[PDB]
Amino acid sequence: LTFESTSRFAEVDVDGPLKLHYHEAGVGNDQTVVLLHGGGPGAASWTNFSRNIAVLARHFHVLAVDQPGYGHSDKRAEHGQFNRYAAMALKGLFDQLGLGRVPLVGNSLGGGTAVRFALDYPARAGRLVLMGPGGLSINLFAPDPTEGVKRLSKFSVAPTRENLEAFLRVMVYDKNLITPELVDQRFALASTPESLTATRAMGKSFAGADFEAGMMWREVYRLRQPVLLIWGREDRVNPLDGALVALKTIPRAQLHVFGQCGHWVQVEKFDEFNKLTIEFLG
Amino acid sequence: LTFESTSRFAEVDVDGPLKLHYHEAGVGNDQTVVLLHGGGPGAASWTNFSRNIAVLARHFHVLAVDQPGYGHSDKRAEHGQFNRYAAMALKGLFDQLGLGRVPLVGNSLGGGTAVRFALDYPARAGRLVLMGPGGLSINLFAPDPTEGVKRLSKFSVAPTRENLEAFLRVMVYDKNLITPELVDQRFALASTPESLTATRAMGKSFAGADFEAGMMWREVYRLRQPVLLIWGREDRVNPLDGALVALKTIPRAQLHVFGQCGHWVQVEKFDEFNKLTIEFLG
Amino acid sequence: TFESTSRFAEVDVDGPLKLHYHEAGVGNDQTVVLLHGGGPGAASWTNFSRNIAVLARHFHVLAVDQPGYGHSDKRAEHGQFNRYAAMALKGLFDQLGLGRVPLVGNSLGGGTAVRFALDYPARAGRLVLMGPGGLSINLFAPDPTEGVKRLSKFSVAPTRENLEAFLRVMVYDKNLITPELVDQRFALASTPESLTATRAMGKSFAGADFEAGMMWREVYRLRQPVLLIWGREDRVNPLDGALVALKTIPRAQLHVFGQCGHWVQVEKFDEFNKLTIEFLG
Amino acid sequence: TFESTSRFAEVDVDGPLKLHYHEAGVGNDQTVVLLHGGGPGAASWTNFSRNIAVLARHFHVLAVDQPGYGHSDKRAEHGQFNRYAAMALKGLFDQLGLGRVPLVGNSLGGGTAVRFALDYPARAGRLVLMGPGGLSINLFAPDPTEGVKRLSKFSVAPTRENLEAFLRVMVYDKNLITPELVDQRFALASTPESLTATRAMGKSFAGADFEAGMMWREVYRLRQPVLLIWGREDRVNPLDGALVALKTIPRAQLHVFGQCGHWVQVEKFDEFNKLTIEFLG
Ligand SMILES: NS(=O)(=O)c1cc(Cl)cc(Cl)c1
Ligand SMILES: NS(=O)(=O)c1cc(Cl)cc(Cl)c1
Ligand SMILES: NS(=O)(=O)c1cc(Cl)cc(Cl)c1
Ligand SMILES: NS(=O)(=O)c1cc(Cl)cc(Cl)c1
Structure with a gap:
């Protein structure tokens, strides 16, 4: 497994052709799992899940999908509420690949x-593993915007190397993970015009009348599958108090x-995260 | 493994000879683990950890100790703050068995x-696994006494079969676990004069000037080992809000x-609990 | 007095619904509506005994018996209760010619x-909400709470002993639960209309409109100032239920x-009265 | 006025310590001590500008510059700060002949x-504590908070730009942070005595007496009524830090x-003044 061996492209239909890039591994295993990466500038499937795809592929058929706006998937200048948009894309990939009911792993x-996918297409989503998830989280104590969200915005307005390192450092507990190479690589991807276009699109979509689609803490009481919530105690983007409504209202939740x-x-907890995910998904 | 094959007795010194009953299993395994049962009338090591001792013994040298006042350990009519009292007893067993630094598993x-043991004898306690633990818990939202604590008290004042079933039913999420046989067996053990004596001793010890020894949420910021906190969302004895101070202040906590x-x-979560404990303890 | 303030009005909620209420302080510039707590034998006058007189020196007070309680109609059927009661209150508003009126509500x-402020947004002003249901969601307390359990137990077995037990976990200071109070509530709660109202309440929970009671989902939409008031030791609607509403209501206080x-x-009548009067004017 | 209320006293805390304070409303029956928030350039008069005049119509007000702030001594060394300041306050109490005095404290x-109420229990009455340090423990917010981070950043690099950034996450309404305010605070914070006080504060954190600052461990011992006041949007000492104290202080309110x-x-001066006056008398 290298970036190239696992790389795959698909074209799906979301108000028109949409190219999705993903990585496929562990082919031949009976049970398929879909991995959905976190946001942040320069983010994509391969780098987000570098400490995991290989391990998970020893147990599952892994599909790690670059969400629209990220990685090598299309970066439209236009789009509605993002989670719903990306979920529609994922639905197209599911239909195309002939996928049934599949467990989902999602970071941030x-x-x-x-979650948006599991709510909109309930028959298609199996067990969920959710790490510092957006959407279903609502920060009952932390004033919004959080530190993490503010630094992301500040990068978006002023996409400098300094602003990106500042953002990355409040993403992790152990700031030694934020090396010069990581910053440089992420900045190179995030700084391209296409990625800047996607950032503009992400910004405008916030003003949309479909904002309620992002407020998934209002809806997860409907989720019938087991759901494993995973949180870093020191998460400064989506802090721990954001886990509480979901833990309370999802009947088969764990945290x-x-x-x-x-x-x-x-x-940051790659070995522990991998064993939890593997055990939880069977 | 039957009750008899694993049964062991030791006499230790806690202001005088104190007989401790415990169960020993999986002899020959390199790493020793000590299991400490929950309270409640009729409780003891074998019945509390019935779904676990066998499994854990496939990996560890297991020592499940009846705390003083419970099981076949001594039921003195007199004793100070309980956790400290039981910890002193456990210290004597540790010294006698030649035990070094050992991980601890404790329910309620x-x-x-x-925890009291890990605080008082810090060099002797390894990793901790703590399930709905008392002591370190402090219920930030739930009014004290909780429902669980009230029903236990009501049994203590009026030790009837009805009061014991009522207590047992708020111990578990799935009330079908509370069968007629469970109630009868527990009532038979809890109703003996010796156990009633131990209940009186437990009651008087609350009035003691050493009460601060029970307030371990004040002290666990000192714990240096990894600690796995485990909670039932629907715990009505020691509710989930009681986990928060410990999660925050123990540096290497997990929940x-x-x-x-x-x-x-x-x-109630015996299969999941066993895999977490086994993985966490190595 | 009970009699001097007593009023009746008949409105339409899927047909005639008679509502009883108490009116005081007429002539005062700002009208305020009071909505009592639940529990057996509850009604406007006895729920707000320590408050109506004090509030009426500042406001025009309307204390309304919610359907199922007091002297208001006790239908044997009805959907989600807060919406049902809100529809009734809406009827009363139009009839009395009210504009935008602050609301005070216990449990x-x-x-x-809250349901009313969401369903008829132009008609509700500032809210004072004491241990309120609806917008509360007990993030830590297992449901049903001990309060709700004892309330249910009474519904199944409506004995004096079970009512007393409920009333006793309703309050911090149990000396407020006098034998006379128990007897007064029990006589009222034990009537066949009242048990019909109690049975109706329980069935409504099974309704398809249950989401209407999940108001923590919707209060981010409230635009008015809202003052939340809680007892730290509330065992019916415990304190952890305040948190979503505090977070999501933009002009909230707690x-x-x-x-x-x-x-x-x-239980905190002097402090409550002063808080309410300042917040409302 | 600043000058008319200004007073000095010298007490013993391991040697002479000069304390500055403001005195007003003399003759009133009940004395109250005010303790300002931290942050660079903070002092009694400017911290409590919207409050001293109002409070002095009801109480005998003593607003004390804590050591390291205002015109009080700024030693380059000192142990855990709240105990250090409490020892100073204790000196002032004995000298002024005070008995049991209610305390008002911000951050x-x-x-x-709180440290004072614990260390000299006979000498403290009711407490009013606004976004207080010491008794707070941020159960959900990762430490250091964003507030504390920007405060630290100023300590390392004391620029106008960094002070403004700190002052701006101190408040909900950033329009309160006027250029003039920034300039006033910065001129005071930038003096070499003040930087010495700032450097002294940072080192004290490394002290062996750190447990003295962990007051959430001890406030279950407070016997007096305590009124906790918080901004929902506090980014220095966030709202989750109120919870242990609310739970464990027997006569608490929030x-x-x-x-x-x-x-x-x-930021909430009228409401705060009214709350404080009622709670204190
Ligand atoms: N709060 S969130 O999970 O939805 C989130 C996290 C990151 Cl790092 C970026 C974006 Cl755009 C959104
Ligand atoms: N809150 S606690 O864990 O310490 C506890 C639980 C039970 Cl079930 C019994 C006793 Cl005596 C004490
Ligand atoms: N949880 S609640 O406020 O809606 C409530 C309280 C009481 Cl005392 C009774 C009823 Cl039926 C409902
Ligand atoms: N967390 S705290 O209240 O103790 C605090 C607040 C401020 Cl603004 C400054 C200092 Cl040095 C300390």
Whole structure:
């Protein structure tokens, strides 16, 4: 497994052709799992889930999808509420690949996409594993915008190297993870005009009349499947108090909280996260 | 493994000889683990950890100790703050068995004993697994006494079969676990004069000037080992809000919460609890 | 007096519905509507005994018996209760010619106040909500709470002993639960109309319109100032149920009283009256 | 006026310590001590500008510059700060012949108020604590909070731009942060004595007496009524830090203002004044 061997493209229909890039691994395993990455500038499937795709592929058929706006998937200048938009895309990939009811793994932005998908297409979503998820989270104590969200915005307005490192450092508990190479690589991807276009589209979509589609804490009481919520105690993007409504209202919820862990659970607690996910998904 | 094959007795010194009953299993395994049962009338090591001792013994050298006042351990009419009292007893067993630094597993009352032990004898306690633990818990939202605590008290004042079933039913999420046989067996053990004596001793000890020894939420910021907190979402004895100070202040804490689970985690979520414990303890 | 303030009105909620209420302080510039808590034998006058007289020196007070309670109609059928009660209140508003009126609500009535403010937004002003149902969601307390359990137990087995047990976990200071109070509530709760109202309440929970009671989902939409008041020791609607509403209601405030249960306006009556009067004017 | 109310006293805390304070409303029956928040350039008069005059019509007000702030001594060394300040306040109490006095404290000063009430229990009456340090423990917010981070950043790099950034996450309404305010605070914070006080504060955190600042451990011992006041949007000492104290202080109350930050007595000054006056008498 390299970026190239696993790379795949599909074209789906979401008000018109939409190219989705994903990675496929562990082919031949009976049970398929879909991984949905976190947001943040420069984010994509391969780098987000580097500490995991290989391990998970020893147990599952893994499909790690670049959400629209990220990675090598299309970066339209236009789009509605994002989680719903990405969920519609994922629905097209599901139909195309002939996929049935599949468990979903989602980190941060992609966790929100996972939930939106599970709500909109309930027969198609199996068990959920959600790490510092957006969407279903609502920060009952932390004033919004959080520190993490503010630094992301500040990057979006002024896309400098300094603003990106500042953002990345409040993503993780262990700031030694934020190396010069990580910052440089992420900045190179995030700084392209296409990615800047996608950032503009993400910004305008917030003003949309479909905003309620992002407020999934209002809806997850309807989720019938087991759901494993995973949180870094020190998450400064989507803080721990945001887990509470979901834990309370999802009937078959579990919550796991890691001390000394930020927003990036699958990297910062990669060994522990992998065993939980593998056990939880069978 | 039967009650008889695993049964062991030791005499330790806590202001005088104190007979401790415990169960020993999986002899020959390199790493020793001590299990400390929950409170409640009729409670003891074998019945509390019935769904677990066998499984854990496939990986560890298991020592499940009847705390003083419970099981076949001594039921003195007199004793000071309980967790400290039971911890002193456990210290004597540790010294006698030549035990070094050992991980501890504790449910409810015994979780408090585990913590008190880890605080008082810090070099002797390894990783902790704590299920709906007393002591370190402090119910920030739930008015005290909780429902669970009130029904236990009501049994203590009026030790009837009806009061014991009522108590047992708020111990678990799935009330079908509370069968006629369970109630009868527990009532038979709890109703003996010796056990009634131990209940009186437990009651008087609350009035003691050493009460601060029970307030372990004040002290667990000192715990240096990894600690796995495990909670039933629907725990009505030690409710979930009681986990928060410990999660915040123990540097290497983790928390796992099971939906559809009460105070009796190791029974109600026995398969999941066993894999977490085994993985966490190595 | 009970009699001097007593009023009746008949409105349309899927047919005639007779509503009883108490009116006081007429002539005052600002009208305020009071909505009592639930529980057996509850009604406007006895729920708000420590408050109507004080409030009427500042406001035009309308204390309304919600359907199923007091001297208001006790239908044997009805859908989600807070919406049902809100529809009734809406009828009363149009009839009395009210504009935008602040609402005061304890427990059940707090839920009705909120449902009303959501369903008829132009008609509700500032809200004072004491241990309110509806907008509360117990993030930590397992449901049903001990309060709700004892209330249910009475519904199944309506004995004096079971009512007393409910009334006793309603309050921090159990000395407020006098034998006379128990006897007064029990005589009222034990009538066949009242048991019909109780049975009707329980069935409504099974309704397809249940989402209407999940008001924590919707209060981010409230634009008016809202003052939440809670007893730290509330065992019916515990304190953790305040949190979503505090977070999501933009002009929210919260006051918490230590040594206070579910019945705020009684157990902390002087402080409640002063808080309410200032917040409302 | 600043000058008319200004007073100095010298007490013993391991040697002479000069304390500055403001005195008003002399002759009133009940004395009240005010303890300002922290942050660079903070002092009694400017912290409590919207409050001293109003409070002095009801109480005998003593607003004390805590050591390290205002015109009080700024030693380059000192142990855990709230105990240090409390020892100073204790000196002032004996000298002025005070008995049992209610305390009002914002942020840092709230922590000092609490430390004082614990260390000299006979000398403290009712407490009013606004976004207080010391007794707070942020159960959900990762530490250091964004507020504390920007405060630290100023300590390392004391620029106008960094002070403004701190002042701006101190408050909900950023229009309160006027250029003039920034300039006033910065001129005071930038003096070499003040930087010495700032450097001293940071080192004290490394002290062996750190447990003295962990007052959430001890307030279950407070016997007096305590009124906690918080801004919902406090980014220095966030709202989740109120919870242990609310739970464990037996006669506690809590008030939370939506649309309010760390600087409660300014951002919600009319409501704060009224709450304080009623609670204290
Ligand atoms: N709060 S959230 O999970 O939805 C989220 C997280 C990140 Cl890092 C980025 C975006 Cl655009 C959104
Ligand atoms: N709150 S606690 O864990 O300490 C506890 C639980 C039970 Cl079931 C019994 C006793 Cl005596 C004490
Ligand atoms: N949870 S609630 O406020 O809606 C409530 C309280 C009482 Cl005391 C009774 C009823 Cl039926 C409902
Ligand atoms: N967390 S705290 O209240 O103690 C506090 C607040 C401020 Cl603004 C400054 C200082 Cl040094 C300390």
